[model samples]
Target chain A: RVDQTPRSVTKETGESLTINCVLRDASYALGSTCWYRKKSGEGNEESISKGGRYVETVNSGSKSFSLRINDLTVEDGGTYRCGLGVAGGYCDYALCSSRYAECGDGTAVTVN
Target chain B: KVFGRCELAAAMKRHGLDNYRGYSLGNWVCAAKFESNFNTQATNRNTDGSTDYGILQINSRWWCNDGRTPGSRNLCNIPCSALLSSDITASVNCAKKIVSDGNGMNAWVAWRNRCKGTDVQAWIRGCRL
Candidate 1:
């Protein structure tokens, strides 16, 4: 499992931010994935798009995924984690697979 | 000390030929002093473990090869010394090809500029005429 983090960039208000996540070896075809932001306190995580933050996902293949965020604000600053599920298995089982990799130590972006 | 002076002069000449033609003789001597401390046999290893060879520190692998002279020994492709023994002009010309094709003069100018107000300028001035 390898973490391929995206490069950090500064964007102005109402600008779009494109973050690319590439998996060299995902072990199986990608079935589904979710993007989440870690909550301020600890254990709680929130879906980035659920709270009116515009988000879109384009899956190029089993090995690559790109997450795009539009019209960012100061509230957009947080650590984002992308979780993936492989085909022919439940999301929990896929997350548990040894072949599944997470984006570790993601870059931070400051919106001006 | 003839060998020493001759080597120094050769290195200076090569430096000028490779970089700037209009450079004064003092500039050559200054560059020689700075580059190898005027040591003809000076050598240093590059980051990739390759050796910088000869009087002017010309990397041999870049110039001397079978392609340069048919049936000639590769001699690790370091042709600077051999070229120097035969003809200093040829050696310097070859070194020029290895060092400054065009952008090398900028480095020489920078060196000259840096030494403008220092004791090094006095040393270069001593070489004039």
Candidate 2:
């Protein structure tokens, strides 16, 4: 399981936003960590790959993770989620399988 | 290297994948299209740090030994690089091993997504095979 802080946020366009995710279980130590976003009412979540306007930082000692979205846009207003995979997990292109995957309650962002 | 439709169909048939274990040649062709666009050198790194190689995008976590994926079973017992060559014999052979495990073509999620239960004949319609 995982916990996310600042469960909600409001940001303006051209601003930046950050979400913090902390792992509640150590079983995911050897596993992969990922960030995802489900835009408002979208049925599926999209994986947030590191690069471009997105940045991620990992603090292995504290089992904490951070994602910073730069130049936030209205489209970025949505629910941001964090995911963890098991040792032998399989991640398909763009998304990780919910089968070997776990998640956090998510941090909802409202962009203006 | 990228293969054309008929070109890939003929090649897979030559490798004896036509109806291999009840999967049609079209099924194999469809898998290659979605998995890697028929590009032999395709490689995708999973979020878990393991990789998928070749047109079929076989996983290094269980199918091949990449020396990086921890706890890899390497059920195919071949180097992950072997799957990237334009010569697809190794790739085809490894895919057969994956399918023969009683999983059929469902071993490839692409196959299940774009090929299974769909009219896959178009994948091989114009192919001579």
Candidate 3:
């Protein structure tokens, strides 16, 4: 797991904001290498990997990626689980053979 | 007066929050501290135009309605203010579903950061189980 540096971020509306989530291991399938935001719930978590406004860029390079939302707003301040795999992705003894197919947690990014 | 921390733990256990999702009684104790400091009516305005309601500080972005945003997920399916009351029946029931749906305690940033795996003996130290 990457060190939880810059653990929380604060910004003002109408300015540039950048969030970077780093991963050290390149073993799991990076197919879903992206960012997700939990507005406040599990299912409400939305993928901002493709939206132009949510993310200006998705820098998925297996090791490091930076997400930049060009303009800041009040709507962007909830907790974000960045650069992880699968939703509610947990196991007891476990399975990740490409169906339950995941085995890691994301970087937590709080955008305020 | 509100509950003491030890008393709060007893209250939470009575409400069936202990070991829910493998969380210790201590876990909920620690969670309450960071979330709302055990204030039954504690409310927080989150930066996303969302607000955290009640002792658990359940955010309006998902768990309740605030009228500013329509169509909140509200997976627990309770009014945000319901948690603010001293009664935690709705709050505990909703929290169980909240943990079940999300990544257990991962639903709470306080747990993930402060109480996830660090030394928690202090959390349960004086509680009566």
Candidate 4:
């Protein structure tokens, strides 16, 4: 698995949500971090952001990025894809900065 | 691969399932058709993480060992792969046992969904007795 996280999760619609990436690389602190939703053939692999109904954050000890969604909707709660591609424009203490990357399945959070 | 009309009827008779335990050949036939479409090697993976095997679609969760997953009740006490054989003797025997447990043919979801109230005489029509 290129990346790992709990395959299934659920949340009520309009509630905020957060999901974690299992790619916590200890040696690399500033890596290319990317996350998107698979959409389950519904549409494109929409790129996520730290501000667009979603925000990205790194835990105090973990190098991986966790995604948080605001007012989660049915369209927002499904499969997600997390990857290490390129970090943000700013510097972050992690691993594999900007150029190098890998990815995997993220979540299937059902919104009721 | 699928079975022929006569091939299935004859095989079911030989294995004592033609009407064994009060279930009709039509019942079993209808169930098998929907379960595997007469293909001896058919298998299906359900969304609930259980798998059904062979013509009967016997679930690995309760019956048959698929060799990888554990905690199977294995009601028929046979390997899941054995049901995939073209001969179908193993599948028939296991199916017989499955029906004998008071479930009748209700153990198969296909029978309940597709064949329960439908006219299934055409399934056995044109077959030699």
Candidate 5:
């Protein structure tokens, strides 16, 4: 009965970044999942990014997730979602209900 | 008389003065018809038994000064009372000034002609009088 998904970074670089998802205290096998990116700019408040593909299961028993973004542009520097399924219920592994993570949230990926 | 009255009514209506709200529309229609028979395109020389020219019946000097600008084409853009004042009596007076400035009265006339017979009540929104 884990209430929240945990995020951990595996690697980061100027050109690429990889984020790993660790689901906590779940007993059921993972089901259909989706990823999304948040939007930016004034008056724009929507999650419009679909991760390249959908993953039904991750790792072995625990629901683990990973994503790699290539050619990181400045516009790509926003919040991302890693969603997972437990039994028939679905939840996001990253910050939920926000297109961009607030300042200091784990969702921000900055490239200089 | 029918054409003359119709022309006058149209001119009055164009300036939002068709009901004879004040002295402005009455005076303007009188002067304009006297000068040009209410013809927007009316123009004449001394040979026409009158020195005034154009629909507003403006003298050459007054016409040149008031009727040569752009706003003179439409009566709606001109206020009627303004025509009677030294500051260019009506809404159409300003239009006349525009006409006098060598500009065509097309815009003003179009505003007047096109907006004619519109729902008077509907058009009165935001209007003071």
Candidate 6:
């Protein structure tokens, strides 16, 4: 399972914010870890790549990763998931498996 | 005034909730049945200190503003009192926004627990509209 810090975040447009995800095991599926964004309802699932307006940081010792979004827009506000084996890849916040298909409850980001 | 089942159904249909966002009029009426028993003035306070208001029981935490709940976002941008009136137009509009911003009709716990995936046509049966 993965846990997220600051369960809900509210930010202004053009501001920068970061969310932290803590994994249950330090050595579990390290490289496959990535951040995902799912908008309200059944909206598209967007992978937050580590470039351009996004930055991803990892701490193997701490079993966690941090996702940062720079120059946030109102579109950035929604649900975010941090997990392994997100093929699109896709993994919501759920229990981790060897299949690496899981995600946690996710973090809520609100950009006003 | 409290609304009869058919009366409420007619009013809601008049507001275009018949198939609004893929939810039938029966779905909304079933939610109102369990949440407020068709009363326009129903209010319930949550353990978290936020309150649910009106026929739909929209919450002060995110939907309506009571001016008291701590950290309320009031996404619906309307006063809590506005939802309590019998007119129901404001309540219907806020409910639409709630559906758009969250899940569909699943946004209402009453709907999820009492009506989701269930045949709710019984609520709208025998109604003129």
State candidate 6's DockQ: 0.05
Candidate 4's docking class is incorrect
Report the poorest 10 consecutive residues by lDDT, candidate 4 chain A: A90-99
Model 1 docking category: incorrect
Give TM-scores of chain A for all candidates.
0.64, 0.82, 0.57, 0.69, 0.54, 0.77
- Steric clash count of candidate 3: 0
DockQ of each: 0.02, 0.02, 0.06, 0.01, 0.00, 0.05
> How many residue pairs of model 4 clash at the backbone?
14
Those runs of model 5 whose alpha carbons end farther than 4 Å from true positions after fitting are: A1-14, A40-57, A85-106, B1-129
**Local accuracy of candidate 3 as per-residue lDDT tens digits, A48-78:** 5546766634344554556666677766766
**TM-scores, all models, native as reference:** 0.35, 0.53, 0.54, 0.51, 0.30, 0.59
Segments of candidate 1 deviating more than 4 angstroms: A39-44, A50-53, A60-62, A86-101, B1-129
lDDT string, candidate 5, B11-47, tens digits: 4556555333222343344445444555555545444
Q: iRMSD (Å) of candidate 6? A: 13.4
Q: Model 5, A1-108: lDDT tens per residue?
A: 212232333233447666566555432233434455563333333432334532223564665655567666666655655553211222233223221111112354
Q: Tens digit of lDDT per residue, candidate 4, span B64-113?
A: 88777766556678998898888888888887765553234656768878
- Model 5: how far residue B23 lies from native, Å: 92
Q: DockQ score of candidate 3?
A: 0.06
**Tens digits of per-residue lDDT for model 3 on B28-86?**
88888887788888887866677888877777766677656786655566778788888
Predicted candidate 1 versus true structure: per-residue lDDT over A10-81, tens digit per residue? 778888777666655433234444466653335555545522444545464645655677788876665665
Comparison by DockQ, 3 against 4, better one: 3
Residue B98's lDDT within candidate 3 is 66
lDDT of 6 by residue, A1-112 (tens): 5688778889999999888877673222343466778875667777666788888888867767888889988878788877654222333332132222335567888999
Tens digit per residue, CA lDDT, model 2, B31-119: 99999999999999888788899989988876799977666677678999999999999999988766653234655778777888888
Clashing pairs in 3: none
What are the lDDT scores of the predictions, listed in order?
0.46, 0.78, 0.61, 0.67, 0.39, 0.75
